[PDB]
Amino acid sequence: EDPPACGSIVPRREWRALASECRERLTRPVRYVVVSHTAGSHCDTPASCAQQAQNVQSYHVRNLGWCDVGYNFLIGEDGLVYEGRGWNIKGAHAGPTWNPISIGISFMGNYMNRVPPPRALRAAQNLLACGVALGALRSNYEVKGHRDVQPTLSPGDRLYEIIQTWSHYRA
Amino acid sequence: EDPPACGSIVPRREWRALASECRERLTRPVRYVVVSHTAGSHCDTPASCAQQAQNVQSYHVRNLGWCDVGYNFLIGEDGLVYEGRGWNIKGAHAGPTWNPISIGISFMGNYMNRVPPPRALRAAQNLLACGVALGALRSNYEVKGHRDVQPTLSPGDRLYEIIQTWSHYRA
Amino acid sequence: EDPPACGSIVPRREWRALASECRERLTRPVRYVVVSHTAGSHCDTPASCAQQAQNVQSYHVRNLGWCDVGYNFLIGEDGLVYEGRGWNIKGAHAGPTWNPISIGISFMGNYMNRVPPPRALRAAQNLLACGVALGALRSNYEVKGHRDVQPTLSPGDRLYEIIQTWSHYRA
Amino acid sequence: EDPPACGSIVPRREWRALASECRERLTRPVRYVVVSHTAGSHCDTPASCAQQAQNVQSYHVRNLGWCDVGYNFLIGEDGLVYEGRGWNIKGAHAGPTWNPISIGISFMGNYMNRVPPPRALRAAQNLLACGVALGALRSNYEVKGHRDVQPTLSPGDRLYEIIQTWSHYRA
């Protein structure tokens, strides 16, 4: 019955993604969101960012044999959100104790000592709002950094430092 | 926060806009939404699209002497929505009959023999969703094409073809 | 015509409030209002109510060592509103999830078996109308009982039946 | 190692706890213990209580949408201790400051003008004895009353006077 006003995702078909092989479903609503970086190249145009989208989905599939790209959603510095596993499918991104209960969104780039552009941040913040809108995320959603759920520098020092200032970031 | 789930709009601050000096308030709800095309050059990256937004505004302000870019919102092929006069300051896009009752959104470029990428069309359709969500737009909002309201060759044939598709398009 | 034309709040120095020490800021407009009750003694005179206000303030500041009384506004059965930490400061009234996105207004007294006098109710409704008139509260703001966001019998079975009857009540 | 036999707690599972979604952790050895009361109806048979324990959790997770019942343990007039969020997971019972450094045991009942039966008191002090032996509580933990750290009536008046008596109670 209910769409409260969503957000605009670049379909898999658009960034030319290999078909997903995953069947494991995330149980809806989800309470946690885990933010990370791909520690890969950055892209600032819709065109390069679709390339970036497929290179990451390919390390993940052709080299680690996962069923699809690890994250549920990706984020480009071009201000757009590329669709990964989406809101419904479980997705390898932060350890087995955390993959079944959270959504993983990953900024595409390495923000160890670089900050994402205001558009990247608006992209993500608005995505979560759409999530709450469809009811795929619960309004009590808690945003957690990846370093907060496992021994990794992700999502990078300078973007980590930033997500902490968000309304939903929890201890 | 543009209250609700306000679908990622690039702010005036960000595209380096000149201060609006517009004073007329839009009467709320804006039942009609008129689509047009600047009939100017187009842009596919956000960088090129900032500077394209600037161009449409200086022309409107320095040359025509208007209080600000005539459009409430400008859409780029970079798939982003650029803020102009916004949801409240009234626009200069369809003449006096329509200007005080409709919100006007323009696609950057001339769509006479060119189609806008689905990201542009997505960014537009999703911009109206944040419109309703805000109470800026009646949920039962009616989309008109420029031609429909004025003696004009815009949105451009191609873009006009498409908006007939839209569920909210009107006779 | 249209100015503030807000109701009439008894300011801090009028009831000898110790110096606020709070520095955290609510960002307006505010979307939510959480109705609480003090669960203490009630009062029906400007004199006794200004006394009550102070007790409640001290318990919260020396006993618990907080930076000021916890609520943003206190309603008295005398028919007046006692300025709590006001429209602009983040105040401790309903957990770390709501405190930053809501206004806490406590109805001095205990309302499990007791109804507040019309005065009280109007003092509270008035205060809210006023809050919108000032752009402190979002116009479509929502009212949620204290027990609707935290484990507590607050506001009192009887007051709770009352606020549920409001147009902004929405849980 | 030396058995530490204090365990005589009813598992989350003998009273049918819904699965918890909480994942934040207390650091052992925990220094503080906060005694609260549920302010709800009490129970005195292990059957009527397991119900009550489910009733409380239902409120916390289904209305307030919390990841699980907020207290770490619950005592009943039945003389039994109910596993809540247990010894290692951070509860939600006394606010942002206390939650991280304390355990919240809470008596199931309204002890405003009632005393809890001796068996409940025994079960509680025994429960604490447990914590120290397991190494979960510091050998010299400090008991604090719910109202001593937050604006409320808990642990109930007569029960508040009773704990003020204990040897680990502190200012």
Side-chain angles (χ1 to χ4, degrees), chain A residues 8-12 14-17 43-54 69 71-86 104-106 108 123 127, chain B residues 78 119 122:
Chain A
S8 47
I9 292 96
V10 174
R12 309 175 56 102
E14 208 167 312
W15 56 273
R16 298 209 267 191
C43 44
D44 47 22
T45 90
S48 42
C49 275
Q51 214 214 232
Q52 265 331 300
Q54 17 197 169
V69 63
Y71 327 100
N72 301 83
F73 296 99
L74 286 294
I75 309 260
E77 272 163 26
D78 62 1
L80 312 177
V81 159
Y82 296 67
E83 167 193 40
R85 299 187 194 203
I105 63 177
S106 174
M108 305 180 66
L127 159 54
Chain B
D78 72 343
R119 59 179 161 274
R122 223 141 47 209

mmCIF file of all heavy atoms in Angstrom, chain A residues 8-12 14-17 43-54 69 71-86 104-106 108 123 127, chain B residues 78 119 122:
data_model
loop_
_atom_site.group_PDB
_atom_site.id
_atom_site.type_symbol
_atom_site.label_atom_id
_atom_site.label_comp_id
_atom_site.label_asym_id
_atom_site.label_seq_id
_atom_site.Cartn_x
_atom_site.Cartn_y
_atom_site.Cartn_z
ATOM 1 N N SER A 8 16.080 8.747 -6.154
ATOM 2 C CA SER A 8 16.314 8.255 -7.510
ATOM 3 C C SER A 8 17.573 7.418 -7.748
ATOM 4 O O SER A 8 18.681 7.944 -7.887
ATOM 5 C CB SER A 8 16.259 9.438 -8.485
ATOM 6 O OG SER A 8 17.018 10.553 -8.031
ATOM 7 N N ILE A 9 17.352 6.104 -7.818
ATOM 8 C CA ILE A 9 18.383 5.090 -8.020
ATOM 9 C C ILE A 9 18.648 4.733 -9.479
ATOM 10 O O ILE A 9 17.724 4.569 -10.278
ATOM 11 C CB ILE A 9 17.993 3.766 -7.316
ATOM 12 C CG1 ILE A 9 18.009 3.943 -5.807
ATOM 13 C CG2 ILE A 9 18.918 2.649 -7.734
ATOM 14 C CD1 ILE A 9 16.655 4.250 -5.233
ATOM 15 N N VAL A 10 19.924 4.591 -9.809
ATOM 16 C CA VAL A 10 20.341 4.187 -11.139
ATOM 17 C C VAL A 10 20.160 2.670 -11.159
ATOM 18 O O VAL A 10 20.863 1.960 -10.448
ATOM 19 C CB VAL A 10 21.822 4.513 -11.344
ATOM 20 C CG1 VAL A 10 22.316 3.953 -12.672
ATOM 21 C CG2 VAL A 10 22.019 6.014 -11.264
ATOM 22 N N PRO A 11 19.205 2.155 -11.956
ATOM 23 C CA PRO A 11 18.929 0.715 -12.063
ATOM 24 C C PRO A 11 20.151 -0.095 -12.462
ATOM 25 O O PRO A 11 21.059 0.430 -13.104
ATOM 26 C CB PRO A 11 17.859 0.647 -13.143
ATOM 27 C CG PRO A 11 17.145 1.931 -12.989
ATOM 28 C CD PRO A 11 18.267 2.919 -12.791
ATOM 29 N N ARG A 12 20.162 -1.375 -12.103
ATOM 30 C CA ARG A 12 21.290 -2.236 -12.448
ATOM 31 C C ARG A 12 21.449 -2.309 -13.962
ATOM 32 O O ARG A 12 22.553 -2.295 -14.499
ATOM 33 C CB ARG A 12 21.062 -3.651 -11.931
ATOM 34 C CG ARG A 12 20.692 -3.776 -10.477
ATOM 35 C CD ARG A 12 20.385 -5.225 -10.205
ATOM 36 N NE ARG A 12 21.524 -6.053 -10.574
ATOM 37 C CZ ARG A 12 22.378 -6.562 -9.697
ATOM 38 N NH1 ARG A 12 22.208 -6.336 -8.403
ATOM 39 N NH2 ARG A 12 23.414 -7.277 -10.109
ATOM 40 N N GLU A 14 20.879 -0.068 -16.107
ATOM 41 C CA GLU A 14 21.573 1.155 -16.556
ATOM 42 C C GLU A 14 23.108 1.165 -16.382
ATOM 43 O O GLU A 14 23.813 1.640 -17.272
ATOM 44 C CB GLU A 14 20.969 2.399 -15.877
ATOM 45 C CG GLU A 14 21.097 3.688 -16.698
ATOM 46 C CD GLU A 14 20.241 4.831 -16.168
ATOM 47 O OE1 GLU A 14 19.041 4.596 -15.899
ATOM 48 O OE2 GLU A 14 20.763 5.963 -16.034
ATOM 49 N N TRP A 15 23.650 0.677 -15.265
ATOM 50 C CA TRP A 15 25.113 0.674 -15.157
ATOM 51 C C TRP A 15 25.676 -0.636 -15.723
ATOM 52 O O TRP A 15 26.870 -0.939 -15.605
ATOM 53 C CB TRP A 15 25.614 0.965 -13.721
ATOM 54 C CG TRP A 15 25.123 0.091 -12.594
ATOM 55 C CD1 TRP A 15 23.984 0.255 -11.857
ATOM 56 C CD2 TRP A 15 25.795 -1.050 -12.043
ATOM 57 N NE1 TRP A 15 23.911 -0.710 -10.879
ATOM 58 C CE2 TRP A 15 25.009 -1.522 -10.974
ATOM 59 C CE3 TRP A 15 26.987 -1.719 -12.351
ATOM 60 C CZ2 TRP A 15 25.378 -2.633 -10.212
ATOM 61 C CZ3 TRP A 15 27.352 -2.826 -11.589
ATOM 62 C CH2 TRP A 15 26.551 -3.270 -10.535
ATOM 63 N N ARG A 16 24.778 -1.375 -16.377
ATOM 64 C CA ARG A 16 25.062 -2.642 -17.051
ATOM 65 C C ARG A 16 25.649 -3.733 -16.172
ATOM 66 O O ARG A 16 26.723 -4.276 -16.433
ATOM 67 C CB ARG A 16 25.944 -2.379 -18.274
ATOM 68 C CG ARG A 16 25.241 -1.488 -19.280
ATOM 69 C CD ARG A 16 25.690 -1.748 -20.695
ATOM 70 N NE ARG A 16 26.787 -0.888 -21.119
ATOM 71 C CZ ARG A 16 27.201 -0.798 -22.379
ATOM 72 N NH1 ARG A 16 26.601 -1.522 -23.322
ATOM 73 N NH2 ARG A 16 28.201 0.017 -22.701
ATOM 74 N N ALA A 17 24.882 -4.079 -15.148
ATOM 75 C CA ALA A 17 25.277 -5.074 -14.175
ATOM 76 C C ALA A 17 24.955 -6.505 -14.542
ATOM 77 O O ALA A 17 23.870 -6.798 -15.044
ATOM 78 C CB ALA A 17 24.632 -4.752 -12.854
ATOM 79 N N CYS A 43 34.992 8.670 -9.109
ATOM 80 C CA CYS A 43 34.496 9.027 -10.430
ATOM 81 C C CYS A 43 33.632 10.220 -10.135
ATOM 82 O O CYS A 43 33.042 10.281 -9.062
ATOM 83 C CB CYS A 43 33.632 7.903 -11.016
ATOM 84 S SG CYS A 43 32.454 7.191 -9.822
ATOM 85 N N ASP A 44 33.576 11.197 -11.030
ATOM 86 C CA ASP A 44 32.693 12.317 -10.751
ATOM 87 C C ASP A 44 31.672 12.554 -11.846
ATOM 88 O O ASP A 44 30.944 13.536 -11.803
ATOM 89 C CB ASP A 44 33.455 13.613 -10.424
ATOM 90 C CG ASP A 44 34.579 13.918 -11.386
ATOM 91 O OD1 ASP A 44 34.565 13.417 -12.529
ATOM 92 O OD2 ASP A 44 35.477 14.693 -10.987
ATOM 93 N N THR A 45 31.602 11.643 -12.812
ATOM 94 C CA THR A 45 30.628 11.774 -13.886
ATOM 95 C C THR A 45 29.787 10.514 -13.937
ATOM 96 O O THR A 45 30.272 9.426 -13.658
ATOM 97 C CB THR A 45 31.295 11.934 -15.255
ATOM 98 O OG1 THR A 45 31.510 10.642 -15.841
ATOM 99 C CG2 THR A 45 32.622 12.642 -15.109
ATOM 100 N N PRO A 46 28.508 10.646 -14.300
ATOM 101 C CA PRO A 46 27.587 9.512 -14.394
ATOM 102 C C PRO A 46 28.145 8.368 -15.243
ATOM 103 O O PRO A 46 27.818 7.193 -15.031
ATOM 104 C CB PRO A 46 26.354 10.133 -15.037
ATOM 105 C CG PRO A 46 26.353 11.511 -14.486
ATOM 106 C CD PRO A 46 27.809 11.912 -14.578
ATOM 107 N N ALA A 47 28.995 8.727 -16.198
ATOM 108 C CA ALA A 47 29.586 7.776 -17.132
ATOM 109 C C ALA A 47 30.723 6.948 -16.561
ATOM 110 O O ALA A 47 30.811 5.741 -16.801
ATOM 111 C CB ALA A 47 30.072 8.525 -18.366
ATOM 112 N N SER A 48 31.611 7.610 -15.834
ATOM 113 C CA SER A 48 32.750 6.932 -15.247
ATOM 114 C C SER A 48 32.269 6.138 -14.049
ATOM 115 O O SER A 48 32.749 5.040 -13.788
ATOM 116 C CB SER A 48 33.807 7.956 -14.833
ATOM 117 O OG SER A 48 33.205 9.087 -14.225
ATOM 118 N N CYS A 49 31.299 6.698 -13.336
ATOM 119 C CA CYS A 49 30.745 6.049 -12.160
ATOM 120 C C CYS A 49 29.984 4.776 -12.469
ATOM 121 O O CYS A 49 29.720 3.993 -11.569
ATOM 122 C CB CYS A 49 29.835 7.002 -11.389
ATOM 123 S SG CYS A 49 30.686 8.107 -10.211
ATOM 124 N N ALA A 50 29.599 4.568 -13.721
ATOM 125 C CA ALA A 50 28.903 3.336 -14.049
ATOM 126 C C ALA A 50 30.016 2.323 -14.308
ATOM 127 O O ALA A 50 29.865 1.134 -14.041
ATOM 128 C CB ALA A 50 28.032 3.518 -15.271
ATOM 129 N N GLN A 51 31.148 2.808 -14.811
ATOM 130 C CA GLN A 51 32.283 1.931 -15.055
ATOM 131 C C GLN A 51 32.662 1.434 -13.663
ATOM 132 O O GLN A 51 32.642 0.235 -13.402
ATOM 133 C CB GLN A 51 33.460 2.698 -15.683
ATOM 134 C CG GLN A 51 34.277 1.863 -16.686
ATOM 135 C CD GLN A 51 35.783 2.187 -16.714
ATOM 136 O OE1 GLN A 51 36.355 2.445 -17.787
ATOM 137 N NE2 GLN A 51 36.438 2.149 -15.545
ATOM 138 N N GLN A 52 32.982 2.372 -12.768
ATOM 139 C CA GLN A 52 33.337 2.069 -11.375
ATOM 140 C C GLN A 52 32.392 1.066 -10.741
ATOM 141 O O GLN A 52 32.801 0.182 -9.980
ATOM 142 C CB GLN A 52 33.294 3.334 -10.520
ATOM 143 C CG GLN A 52 34.618 4.023 -10.368
ATOM 144 C CD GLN A 52 35.768 3.048 -10.463
ATOM 145 O OE1 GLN A 52 35.885 2.107 -9.664
ATOM 146 N NE2 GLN A 52 36.621 3.253 -11.462
ATOM 147 N N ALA A 53 31.111 1.242 -11.028
ATOM 148 C CA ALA A 53 30.106 0.359 -10.498
ATOM 149 C C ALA A 53 30.399 -1.050 -10.976
ATOM 150 O O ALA A 53 30.443 -1.967 -10.159
ATOM 151 C CB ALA A 53 28.735 0.795 -10.947
ATOM 152 N N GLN A 54 30.626 -1.250 -12.276
ATOM 153 C CA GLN A 54 30.881 -2.618 -12.717
ATOM 154 C C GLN A 54 32.231 -3.228 -12.323
ATOM 155 O O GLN A 54 32.305 -4.443 -12.132
ATOM 156 C CB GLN A 54 30.620 -2.791 -14.224
ATOM 157 C CG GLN A 54 30.558 -1.514 -15.029
ATOM 158 C CD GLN A 54 29.909 -1.692 -16.402
ATOM 159 O OE1 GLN A 54 29.609 -0.707 -17.077
ATOM 160 N NE2 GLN A 54 29.696 -2.940 -16.818
ATOM 161 N N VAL A 69 27.440 -8.023 -6.326
ATOM 162 C CA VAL A 69 28.274 -7.008 -5.701
ATOM 163 C C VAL A 69 27.938 -7.088 -4.202
ATOM 164 O O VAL A 69 26.797 -7.348 -3.830
ATOM 165 C CB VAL A 69 27.945 -5.591 -6.323
ATOM 166 C CG1 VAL A 69 26.504 -5.201 -6.029
ATOM 167 C CG2 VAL A 69 28.930 -4.529 -5.827
ATOM 168 N N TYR A 71 27.710 -4.767 -1.627
ATOM 169 C CA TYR A 71 26.817 -3.784 -1.017
ATOM 170 C C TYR A 71 25.405 -3.738 -1.569
ATOM 171 O O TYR A 71 25.139 -4.203 -2.682
ATOM 172 C CB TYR A 71 27.451 -2.409 -1.137
ATOM 173 C CG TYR A 71 28.961 -2.461 -1.055
ATOM 174 C CD1 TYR A 71 29.746 -2.409 -2.213
ATOM 175 C CD2 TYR A 71 29.606 -2.569 0.178
ATOM 176 C CE1 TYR A 71 31.141 -2.466 -2.147
ATOM 177 C CE2 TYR A 71 31.002 -2.631 0.258
ATOM 178 C CZ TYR A 71 31.763 -2.572 -0.908
ATOM 179 O OH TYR A 71 33.141 -2.629 -0.841
ATOM 180 N N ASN A 72 24.495 -3.175 -0.781
ATOM 181 C CA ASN A 72 23.108 -3.045 -1.212
ATOM 182 C C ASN A 72 22.957 -1.835 -2.135
ATOM 183 O O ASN A 72 22.166 -1.860 -3.086
ATOM 184 C CB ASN A 72 22.194 -2.925 -0.005
ATOM 185 C CG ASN A 72 22.304 -4.119 0.897
ATOM 186 O OD1 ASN A 72 23.204 -4.200 1.728
ATOM 187 N ND2 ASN A 72 21.405 -5.075 0.719
ATOM 188 N N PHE A 73 23.723 -0.785 -1.849
ATOM 189 C CA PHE A 73 23.721 0.419 -2.669
ATOM 190 C C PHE A 73 25.106 1.020 -2.697
ATOM 191 O O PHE A 73 25.863 0.897 -1.738
ATOM 192 C CB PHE A 73 22.763 1.488 -2.138
ATOM 193 C CG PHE A 73 21.332 1.083 -2.155
ATOM 194 C CD1 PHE A 73 20.725 0.622 -0.993
ATOM 195 C CD2 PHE A 73 20.599 1.114 -3.342
ATOM 196 C CE1 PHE A 73 19.406 0.197 -0.995
ATOM 197 C CE2 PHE A 73 19.273 0.690 -3.362
ATOM 198 C CZ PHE A 73 18.674 0.224 -2.182
ATOM 199 N N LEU A 74 25.417 1.676 -3.809
ATOM 200 C CA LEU A 74 26.697 2.341 -4.011
ATOM 201 C C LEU A 74 26.446 3.828 -4.171
ATOM 202 O O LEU A 74 25.351 4.260 -4.540
ATOM 203 C CB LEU A 74 27.394 1.858 -5.279
ATOM 204 C CG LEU A 74 28.087 0.511 -5.476
ATOM 205 C CD1 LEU A 74 29.293 0.423 -4.578
ATOM 206 C CD2 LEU A 74 27.112 -0.610 -5.235
ATOM 207 N N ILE A 75 27.489 4.609 -3.938
ATOM 208 C CA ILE A 75 27.373 6.047 -4.029
ATOM 209 C C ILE A 75 28.518 6.662 -4.799
ATOM 210 O O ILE A 75 29.681 6.417 -4.491
ATOM 211 C CB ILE A 75 27.388 6.660 -2.656
ATOM 212 C CG1 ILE A 75 26.355 5.959 -1.770
ATOM 213 C CG2 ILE A 75 27.188 8.153 -2.779
ATOM 214 C CD1 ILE A 75 25.055 6.698 -1.612
ATOM 215 N N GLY A 76 28.183 7.482 -5.789
ATOM 216 C CA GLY A 76 29.208 8.130 -6.580
ATOM 217 C C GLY A 76 29.347 9.601 -6.238
ATOM 218 O O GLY A 76 28.411 10.247 -5.759
ATOM 219 N N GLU A 77 30.534 10.138 -6.474
ATOM 220 C CA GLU A 77 30.765 11.536 -6.206
ATOM 221 C C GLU A 77 30.009 12.353 -7.227
ATOM 222 O O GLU A 77 29.991 13.578 -7.164
ATOM 223 C CB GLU A 77 32.245 11.831 -6.286
ATOM 224 C CG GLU A 77 32.935 11.625 -4.975
ATOM 225 C CD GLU A 77 34.415 11.528 -5.140
ATOM 226 O OE1 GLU A 77 34.934 12.084 -6.130
ATOM 227 O OE2 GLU A 77 35.067 10.905 -4.280
ATOM 228 N N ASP A 78 29.378 11.670 -8.172
ATOM 229 C CA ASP A 78 28.622 12.358 -9.199
ATOM 230 C C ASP A 78 27.248 12.688 -8.667
ATOM 231 O O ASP A 78 26.384 13.158 -9.399
ATOM 232 C CB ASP A 78 28.508 11.493 -10.451
ATOM 233 C CG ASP A 78 27.764 10.197 -10.203
ATOM 234 O OD1 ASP A 78 27.310 9.967 -9.064
ATOM 235 O OD2 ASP A 78 27.628 9.404 -11.159
ATOM 236 N N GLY A 79 27.050 12.432 -7.383
ATOM 237 C CA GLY A 79 25.769 12.719 -6.771
ATOM 238 C C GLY A 79 24.683 11.668 -6.940
ATOM 239 O O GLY A 79 23.603 11.839 -6.386
ATOM 240 N N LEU A 80 24.942 10.586 -7.675
ATOM 241 C CA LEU A 80 23.911 9.565 -7.871
ATOM 242 C C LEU A 80 24.139 8.258 -7.116
ATOM 243 O O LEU A 80 25.271 7.889 -6.783
ATOM 244 C CB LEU A 80 23.748 9.237 -9.357
ATOM 245 C CG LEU A 80 23.612 10.376 -10.374
ATOM 246 C CD1 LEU A 80 23.537 9.776 -11.763
ATOM 247 C CD2 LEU A 80 22.383 11.226 -10.097
ATOM 248 N N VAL A 81 23.037 7.558 -6.862
ATOM 249 C CA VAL A 81 23.050 6.273 -6.164
ATOM 250 C C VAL A 81 22.880 5.129 -7.154
ATOM 251 O O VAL A 81 21.858 5.030 -7.824
ATOM 252 C CB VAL A 81 21.890 6.148 -5.155
ATOM 253 C CG1 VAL A 81 21.633 4.693 -4.860
ATOM 254 C CG2 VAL A 81 22.211 6.873 -3.883
ATOM 255 N N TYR A 82 23.875 4.260 -7.232
ATOM 256 C CA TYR A 82 23.802 3.118 -8.124
ATOM 257 C C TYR A 82 23.253 1.960 -7.301
ATOM 258 O O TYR A 82 23.667 1.745 -6.160
ATOM 259 C CB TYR A 82 25.188 2.808 -8.688
ATOM 260 C CG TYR A 82 25.712 3.938 -9.537
ATOM 261 C CD1 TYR A 82 26.035 5.168 -8.967
ATOM 262 C CD2 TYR A 82 25.826 3.806 -10.917
ATOM 263 C CE1 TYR A 82 26.426 6.254 -9.749
ATOM 264 C CE2 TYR A 82 26.221 4.886 -11.715
ATOM 265 C CZ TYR A 82 26.526 6.110 -11.119
ATOM 266 O OH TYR A 82 26.883 7.204 -11.889
ATOM 267 N N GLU A 83 22.298 1.233 -7.866
ATOM 268 C CA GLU A 83 21.686 0.116 -7.161
ATOM 269 C C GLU A 83 22.530 -1.151 -7.153
ATOM 270 O O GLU A 83 23.008 -1.591 -8.200
ATOM 271 C CB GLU A 83 20.332 -0.209 -7.772
ATOM 272 C CG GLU A 83 19.775 -1.529 -7.309
ATOM 273 C CD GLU A 83 18.612 -1.976 -8.148
ATOM 274 O OE1 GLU A 83 18.680 -1.800 -9.387
ATOM 275 O OE2 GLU A 83 17.641 -2.511 -7.571
ATOM 276 N N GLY A 84 22.691 -1.728 -5.960
ATOM 277 C CA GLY A 84 23.447 -2.957 -5.786
ATOM 278 C C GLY A 84 22.477 -4.093 -5.510
ATOM 279 O O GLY A 84 21.693 -4.459 -6.388
ATOM 280 N N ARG A 85 22.493 -4.669 -4.314
ATOM 281 C CA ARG A 85 21.538 -5.734 -4.063
ATOM 282 C C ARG A 85 20.152 -5.168 -3.709
ATOM 283 O O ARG A 85 19.170 -5.909 -3.675
ATOM 284 C CB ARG A 85 22.043 -6.668 -2.965
ATOM 285 C CG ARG A 85 23.355 -7.367 -3.310
ATOM 286 C CD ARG A 85 23.727 -8.425 -2.260
ATOM 287 N NE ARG A 85 25.114 -8.877 -2.380
ATOM 288 C CZ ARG A 85 25.555 -10.043 -1.925
ATOM 289 N NH1 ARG A 85 24.718 -10.868 -1.331
ATOM 290 N NH2 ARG A 85 26.828 -10.382 -2.050
ATOM 291 N N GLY A 86 20.063 -3.862 -3.457
ATOM 292 C CA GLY A 86 18.777 -3.267 -3.137
ATOM 293 C C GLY A 86 18.368 -3.437 -1.688
ATOM 294 O O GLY A 86 19.188 -3.798 -0.850
ATOM 295 N N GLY A 104 24.099 -2.286 3.720
ATOM 296 C CA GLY A 104 25.422 -1.716 3.577
ATOM 297 C C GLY A 104 25.436 -0.786 2.386
ATOM 298 O O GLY A 104 25.088 -1.188 1.276
ATOM 299 N N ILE A 105 25.778 0.475 2.602
ATOM 300 C CA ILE A 105 25.851 1.389 1.483
ATOM 301 C C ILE A 105 27.300 1.793 1.480
ATOM 302 O O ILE A 105 27.887 2.056 2.529
ATOM 303 C CB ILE A 105 24.913 2.625 1.630
ATOM 304 C CG1 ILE A 105 25.297 3.480 2.830
ATOM 305 C CG2 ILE A 105 23.471 2.171 1.774
ATOM 306 C CD1 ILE A 105 24.439 4.742 2.948
ATOM 307 N N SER A 106 27.892 1.812 0.300
ATOM 308 C CA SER A 106 29.292 2.128 0.208
ATOM 309 C C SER A 106 29.605 3.277 -0.736
ATOM 310 O O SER A 106 29.167 3.289 -1.883
ATOM 311 C CB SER A 106 30.038 0.864 -0.219
ATOM 312 O OG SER A 106 31.401 1.131 -0.469
ATOM 313 N N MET A 108 31.763 5.091 -3.276
ATOM 314 C CA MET A 108 32.780 4.566 -4.169
ATOM 315 C C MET A 108 33.965 5.488 -4.235
ATOM 316 O O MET A 108 33.948 6.510 -4.914
ATOM 317 C CB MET A 108 32.233 4.369 -5.569
ATOM 318 C CG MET A 108 31.013 3.500 -5.638
ATOM 319 S SD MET A 108 30.536 3.397 -7.346
ATOM 320 C CE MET A 108 31.937 2.500 -7.943
ATOM 321 N N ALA A 123 23.111 12.423 -1.469
ATOM 322 C CA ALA A 123 22.650 11.209 -2.137
ATOM 323 C C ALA A 123 22.324 10.142 -1.098
ATOM 324 O O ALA A 123 21.219 9.590 -1.083
ATOM 325 C CB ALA A 123 23.714 10.695 -3.083
ATOM 326 N N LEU A 127 18.833 8.721 0.269
ATOM 327 C CA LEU A 127 18.552 7.297 0.086
ATOM 328 C C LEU A 127 17.943 6.679 1.339
ATOM 329 O O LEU A 127 16.936 5.976 1.265
ATOM 330 C CB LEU A 127 19.851 6.579 -0.293
ATOM 331 C CG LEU A 127 20.114 5.081 -0.131
ATOM 332 C CD1 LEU A 127 19.068 4.230 -0.804
ATOM 333 C CD2 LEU A 127 21.472 4.811 -0.734
ATOM 334 N N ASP B 78 22.925 15.440 -16.291
ATOM 335 C CA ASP B 78 23.860 14.872 -15.346
ATOM 336 C C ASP B 78 22.989 14.190 -14.285
ATOM 337 O O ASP B 78 23.479 13.701 -13.264
ATOM 338 C CB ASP B 78 24.707 15.974 -14.705
ATOM 339 C CG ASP B 78 23.918 16.833 -13.722
ATOM 340 O OD1 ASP B 78 22.670 16.824 -13.745
ATOM 341 O OD2 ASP B 78 24.558 17.533 -12.918
ATOM 342 N N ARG B 119 17.923 9.305 -16.475
ATOM 343 C CA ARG B 119 18.252 9.875 -15.186
ATOM 344 C C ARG B 119 17.635 11.263 -15.088
ATOM 345 O O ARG B 119 17.126 11.646 -14.039
ATOM 346 C CB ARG B 119 19.754 9.919 -14.960
ATOM 347 C CG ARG B 119 20.535 10.689 -15.938
ATOM 348 C CD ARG B 119 21.958 10.608 -15.498
ATOM 349 N NE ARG B 119 22.870 10.935 -16.577
ATOM 350 C CZ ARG B 119 23.315 10.058 -17.471
ATOM 351 N NH1 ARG B 119 22.934 8.782 -17.412
ATOM 352 N NH2 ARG B 119 24.136 10.469 -18.428
ATOM 353 N N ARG B 122 14.126 10.692 -14.461
ATOM 354 C CA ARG B 122 13.953 10.170 -13.111
ATOM 355 C C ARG B 122 14.064 11.322 -12.124
ATOM 356 O O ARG B 122 13.185 11.513 -11.288
ATOM 357 C CB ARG B 122 15.022 9.139 -12.806
ATOM 358 C CG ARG B 122 14.515 7.917 -12.102
ATOM 359 C CD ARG B 122 15.242 6.733 -12.675
ATOM 360 N NE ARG B 122 16.679 6.975 -12.751
ATOM 361 C CZ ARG B 122 17.466 6.417 -13.663
ATOM 362 N NH1 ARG B 122 16.940 5.613 -14.576
ATOM 363 N NH2 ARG B 122 18.766 6.669 -13.680
#
